[PDB]
Amino acid sequence: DAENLYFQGNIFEMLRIDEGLRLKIYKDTEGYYTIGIGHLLTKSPSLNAAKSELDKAIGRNTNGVITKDEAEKLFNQDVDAAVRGILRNAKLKPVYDSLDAVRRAALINMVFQMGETGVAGFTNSLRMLQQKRWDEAAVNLAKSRWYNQTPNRAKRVITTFRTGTWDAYAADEVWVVGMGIVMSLIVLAIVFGNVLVITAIAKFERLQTVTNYFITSLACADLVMGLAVVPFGAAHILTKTWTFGNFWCEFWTSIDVLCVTASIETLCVIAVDRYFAITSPFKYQSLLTKNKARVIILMVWIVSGLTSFLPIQMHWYRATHQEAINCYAEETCCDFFTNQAYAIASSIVSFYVPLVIMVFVYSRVFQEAKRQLQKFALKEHKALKTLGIIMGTFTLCWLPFFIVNIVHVIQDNLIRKEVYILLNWIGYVNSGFNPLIYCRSPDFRIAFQELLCL
Ligand SMILES: CC(C)N[C@@H]1CCc2c(ccc(O)c2O)[C@H]1O
Ligand code: NA
């Protein structure tokens, strides 16, 4: 023994990967009602009949939703029962003893998906496993109804029978560290680039323009993103729990909407800023005093703090469904749950209103470039590439999330929890992209050369 590295070999982890933990009732690949980790509730298609078995098996009014503690106990029970059925059964016991440790898990994994009676119907494939003809049983087992309905999970178990090793599953562990180091590169990039932007404007007179005053507010929201928002969410995803208590859960949730709102509303302020600086250069400097710009900065942070802490810290954002009420009570749960009132209104204030203003002025900056005092020249394609990056980058990062942000409260279980977090993180990396977009000026290009080399 003496093995506490990561990924031990066991049926416990093997089944977590094939089943996945899911606290609310759901229809499996076939359509049967299931909960927890691959727990079959009932074959009756009525959801109320599924709750009745769950409420009896739990000893509580679950409302179709169980806690992460209850799911683990149903998972060990279904596992311990699959072994008891292998031992009570005539076809399975000889093959279970004849099997080695790793291939015993493959036999338990079938019995926990199909029952003792079902796994025992593989008379030929069990006869092949009996004589240790792994490659021949792997060919046989790939011809069955079981392979046909869940080819992914069957190919993994069949490979575990064939090779006798966990390579069908051990590749899962490489994706954990690869996700982690990628998160570390994201946190370093956002903090590196945005601390550099804020510093160049603070120490350097040539960079204290009105347009950089908005750049500074953008880099401030992006800096808090990489110092506060991103790091706790990386610890959330990797630990698969929340270790900082309930109060810090919502105030991490509060700082997140605070930054993403102020970040995008600043990008909207910049798009209008350059529209006046480009199309009306002379009034743009007469009207927009450094004080008037600072008031515009306070409007964004006041709209953002009202759209982020005020709802969340007042519990207005909260959902009412049972998995939401449980997560609000779990100290270790910090999953995001909202009502359709908040998921919609925040997307308008955070993303959609700024998006429309931005799609409007940037396009108008080019329509009114045409009606000037003058030939298919090269600097227009150069400028056309530049704004395509300014709007192609902002769109690909946040549009996929805020679309999904609206849909996940319109038709439930249409957007997997997994995808909602990935598109959310795909938005988080906008904060690292921004310094590489809005700070390409020769004045910045010099301040960055002197801040680093000299
Ligand atoms: C809860 C944290 C972890 N993610 C949020 C969830 C929705 C949301 C974001 C940003 C701005 C908004 O307006 C939002 O409604 C995302 O970052
Ligand atoms: Na909570």
Author numbering: 858 to 1231, 1263 to 1342
Text taken from the publication that reported this structure:
Nb6B9 binds to the intracellular surface of the β2AR, the G protein binding site, and stabilizes its active conformation.
We synthesized all the eight possible isomers of ISO. Of which, the (R,R) form (compound 8, c-ISO) showed the highest affinity for both the β1AR and the β2AR, but not the αARs, in radioligand competition binding assay. Interestingly, the (R,R)-isomer also showed selectivity towards the β2AR over β1AR. Our structures reveal that F19345.52 on β2AR needs to move up by ~0.8 Å in order to accommodate the two carbons that rigidifies c-Epi. Similar upward movement of F19345.52 is observed in the β2AR-c-ISO structure. Constrained ISO, however, displays greater than a 70-fold selectivity for β2AR afforded by a greater than a 100-fold decrease in the potency at β1AR for recruiting β-arrestin. Interestingly, constraining isoproterenol had a major impact on β-arrestin recruitment through β1AR (100-fold decrease in potency compared to ISO) with little enhancing effect on β-arrestin recruitment by β2AR. Taken together, these data suggest that constraining isoproterenol appears as a β1AR-selective diminution, yielding a large effect on the relative effectiveness and hence biasing the signaling away from β-arrestin recruitment.
